[PDB]
Amino acid sequence: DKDKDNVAPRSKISPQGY
Amino acid sequence: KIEEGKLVIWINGDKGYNGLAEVGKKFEKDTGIKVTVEHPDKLEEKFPQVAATGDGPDIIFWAHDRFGGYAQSGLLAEITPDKAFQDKLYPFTWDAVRYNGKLIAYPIAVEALSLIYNKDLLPNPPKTWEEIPALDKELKAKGKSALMFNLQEPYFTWPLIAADGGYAFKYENGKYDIKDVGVDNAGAKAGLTFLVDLIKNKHMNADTDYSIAEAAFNKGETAMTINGPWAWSNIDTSKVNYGVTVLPTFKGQPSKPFVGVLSAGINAASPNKELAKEFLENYLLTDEGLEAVNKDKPLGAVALKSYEEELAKDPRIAATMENAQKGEIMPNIPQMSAFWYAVRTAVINAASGRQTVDEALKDAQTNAAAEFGGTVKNYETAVQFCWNHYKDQMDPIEKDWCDWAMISRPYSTLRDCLEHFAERFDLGFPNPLAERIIFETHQIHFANCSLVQPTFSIQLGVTRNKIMTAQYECYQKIMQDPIQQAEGVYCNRTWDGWLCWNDVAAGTESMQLCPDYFQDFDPSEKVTKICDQDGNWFRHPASNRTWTNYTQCNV
Ligand SMILES: OC[C@H]1O[C@H](O[C@H]2[C@H](O)[C@@H](O)[C@@H](O)O[C@@H]2CO)[C@H](O)[C@@H](O)[C@@H]1O
């Protein structure tokens, strides 16, 4: 679980992202 | 159309545009010609887009590194200064704006990054990068930090990455071999590792940008920053007692900033080329014009010898040039746009932990090379390049196409490549061409597999594996079940980048739990996606891209 990436990329949550 | 009888000038928002407008005022007083100075966001990108259609400013200011690409695109007038005028500027500043043997812009001033330090916090700043961790530990005990600088732009991190042997291209015998690139090499890896370890150990934060670093320094919170001459005005206003000095060494060698020459080009589509020339030669490039801009935000070491001499005793300028001599003048060749995009992506990926430093640099160089040698010049060629690599990886492992352990890395790299180039070419992701490519692999490589789900018979990291497994399942499920059995208007099943969404009736807000991909996602919170009254998935109006709402996952 610490092997997961720390922070979801903000750009992918933004209106430009997914 | 660019309007005749006036001048529109673009220059970046960190430079002395108010001072430049005062130069414009003097021009208009004398000639009646109005000069408008603008500082659009992302102007180095905006210029080639608008000028390609014969629009844009009459005059564009940037560092010289972008100008060869502009010239190659047919966007710049060749400038024609006479011998007497050329003699007024340093030969090496003309060399920065000389491309294929022609002058493509007027050189204005030499910029290099320095180490800027707070004398009240740190009277003897560190000579080496290696001592910065221990120093930060001391400072943190007192509520301060050692170092903050812009991590978002690779300009600021390149000095460290180059120190032990990173390079863009080598200028030998008057030529650049763009096949010989120094992004993916041991020295670049060592310097990027060191940067990443600073972040891992909480001496720096991966999110730090220009504004955050400037504000921390100017408020007295951080003992050091890294910046150019333009930044000294705001420091002066803040009254921090600062010094400007040589950058720290890494592994015993100098940090090597990439040196820029602020330059001014004339748009090939301007109907005012003569006016632009007069402004640039006889108003801006004079002691009085350069003083006006410099008083607003410092230029560095100006190209005009008379004024450079006047200001040369500034120790901050001396420091600027000592750093410059340790670094390298940037190339001006067209490949620079792709070089910088590569370094930016590598740094972002490694600093966030998304990729290892080795993978980040290796992929950055692979995709940059695709552009440098002319194979990839748009998204259609990019997708062909990504597919061809993928095929080359899949062909020898045919008996194992149904084994996730053998195909996961090629399949993941396929998506990394398609998505890299989408961002590069200002497209969204997913997009219809990339989706067609992914469907094609499902058709030709995975069609004999018995299961919708991936199954087994270096590996991807935990997060990437979760995303790619979900992706595979989603495409396989679409392949399995194209039909809609119910009567009516329905959005179709779709992969959004992170999650699979079932087909649903028009006018539904579908909901699923947040995926467990990231440590800062709450897997009990919800993700929503709207299927509109016409049976199309909702597009965000800011982008016009199909858009899922993950905003609650992260809170
Ligand atoms: O970070 C990549 C970027 O680096 C340089 O841009 C500098 C510029 O030269 C300075 O004048 C100042 O404005 O900061 C910029 C960095 O944010 C290259 O000139 C530029 O082409 C490149 O994209």
Q: Can you walk through the features of this model?
A:
It is classed as membrane protein/hormone. The complex is a heterodimer of chains A (18) and B (555). Chain A is built from one helix and no strands. Chain A is mostly helical. Chain B is an alpha+beta fold and 555 residues long. Chain B has a domain at 114-258: D-Maltodextrin-Binding Protein, domain 2. Chain B is 41% helix and 15% strand. Chain B is globular, with a radius of gyration of 27 Å. The complex binds a molecule of 2 linked components (GLC-GLC). A molecule of 2 linked components (GLC-GLC) is lined by residues 12, 14, 44, 63, 65-66, 111, 153-155, 228, 260, 340 of chain B. The site of a molecule of 2 linked components (GLC-GLC) has 13 residues of chain B, from helix 7.
Structural class of chain B: alpha+beta
Based on the structure given, which CATH architecture of the domain at 114-258 in chain B is correct?
A: 3-Layer(aba) Sandwich
Q: State the CATH superfamily name of the domain at 114-258 in chain B.
A: Periplasmic binding protein-like II
In N-to-C order, the SSE pattern of chain A is H
The helicity of chain A comes to 10-25%
Cα radius of gyration of chain A in angstroms: 10 Å
How far apart, in Å, are the first and last alpha carbons of chain A? 23 Å
Pfam families (chain B): SBP_bac_1
Subunit structure (chain B): The complex is composed of two ATP-binding proteins (MalK), two transmembrane proteins (MalG and MalF) and a solute-binding protein (MalE).
GO molecular function (chain B): carbohydrate transmembrane transporter activity; maltose binding
Family (chain B): Belongs to the bacterial solute-binding protein 1 family.
